[PDB]
Homo-oligomer: A and B are copies of this chain.
Amino acid sequence: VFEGHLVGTGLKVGVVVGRFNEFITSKLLGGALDGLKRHGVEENDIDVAWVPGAFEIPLIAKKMANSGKYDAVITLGTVIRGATTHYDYVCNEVAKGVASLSLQTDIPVIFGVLTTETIEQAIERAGTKAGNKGYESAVAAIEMAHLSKHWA
Contacts and interface: CB of A to CB of B under 8 A. Distances in A.
A76 interface: no
B22 A86 contact: no
A5 B38 contact: yes
* Oligomer copy total: 10
A27 B96 CA distance: 30
Contact of A3 (B49, B86, B97): B49
B23 A102 contact: no
Interface size class of A (residues with CB under 8 A): 35 or more
Nearest to A120: B119
B89 A97 contact: no
Interface in A84-121: 84-86, 88-93, 95-97, 99-103, 106, 108, 110-111, 114-117, 119-121
A62 to B, nearest CB: 6
B49 A83 contact: no
Given A27-B23, A144-B51, A103 B97 contact: yes
Contact of A6 (B38, B84, B129): B38
Contacts of A92: 89, 95-96
A47 B129 contact: no
A30 B22 contact: yes
Contacts of A55: 99, 110-111
Interface centre among A24, A38, A80, A119 (most CB of B within 10 A): A38
Closest 7 CB pairs of A and B: A23-B127, A6-B38, A89-B95, A97-B100, A52-B140, A93-B99, A2-B49
